[PDB]
Structure formats: structure tokens, C-alpha cells
Design a binder for these strands. Structure first.
Length: 94
RNA sequence: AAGCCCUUGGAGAGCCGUAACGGUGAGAAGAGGGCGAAGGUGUGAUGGGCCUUCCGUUAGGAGGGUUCUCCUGAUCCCUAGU
């Protein structure tokens, strides 16, 4: 997973944070979403509800928002990642 | 006003902020808003009560003024922190 995520952020277009990627999910404008396991429960089952209405891949990350933020290189936590453009990586088949 | 809420917005190797601790992608600053102390300002009140002058000096009667610019201040009151 980390191999594709390295390539995804190098060339693709990405959205960090719950609020911005939650609105795009309701209108069906994200290719895919990855969720860390430490996200708040009220927001996690909102992701799962709106995902069944549009057939968008959902990936459940094992770690927390801190080692998900560190993978992106961003100095603080990111709990939800919205994939709006794959770029050239091969992540969207998961 | 503090505090807590609501839309928008989208930040980092940084920004915002306190008397201090601090806050932030689980969404900061910036823009607008909602609920919101003690008190204050009007009305209550050409009502009083306060200072004062003159006459008759019995009973009383007839007038005048009650404005303006600042400072300090609780161990009383309400409001948030830690």
C-alpha cells in the first residue's frame, strides 16, 4: 500500500481532511477514499453510508491518523484522504 | 463581554493567541451570524428632596438654584481561565 501511496502523492491530486472529502463523497466526485482506524465513530459510519450510494472504493488503514499523516509527509494528523485524480499510480484497484 | 454554538474558508516546517497554560486537517486565521452577566441609558419623575432669599414674624405666603469636564476605586457584584 505504501508503494502506491508514494507514487499517488508524487503525481496525483489528493484531498486531506474529513470535511472537504465528505462533501465530494456525497456528490460522487472522488475516485476513492482511505480511512484510518482511529477516526471518530460518527464520521466513520457517515463515510460508510454515503459510499454505498455511489460504489466508491473504501480502504481501511490499520494505523492511526498520525502515521497516516507521516506517510503523506504532513506534520500533523490526517484521518481521511480523498483521491480525486490517480495520476499515474496503480492504487485505485484496491 | 466572556463563553458556547451556525454557514463559508482551507493552513506546515508554519500560522493564531494568553496574565499563564495554550489552539489547529476530528478543520487555524480571515469573513459573516445565533444564544447570551453584574450593570448602563431612557421612562418611572414639570414628581420629590437638597441648598437658599424676602414679607408677615399668629396663620402662612412669594421667589432663586439644583449645571459642566475629568481622575481613583473595593475585602461588594458577575464572568471566564488554570
Amino acid at each position: 500500500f505504501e508503494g502506491e501511496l508514494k507514487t499517488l502523492l508524487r503525481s496525483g491530486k489528493v484531498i486531506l481532511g474529513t470535511r472537504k472529502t465528505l462533501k465530494l463523497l456525497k456528490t460522487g466526485k472522488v475516485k476513492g477514499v482511505v480511512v484510518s482506524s482511529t477516526l471518530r465513530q460518527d464520521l466513520k459510519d457517515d463515510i460508510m453510508t454515503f459510499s454505498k450510494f455511489s460504489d466508491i472504493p473504501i480502504y481501511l488503514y490499520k494505523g492511526s491518523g498520525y502515521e497516516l499523516g507521516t506517510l503523506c509527509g504532513k506534520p500533523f494528523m490526517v484521518s481521511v484522504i480523498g483521491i480525486v485524480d490517480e495520476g499515474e499510480s496503480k492504487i485505485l484497484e484496491f
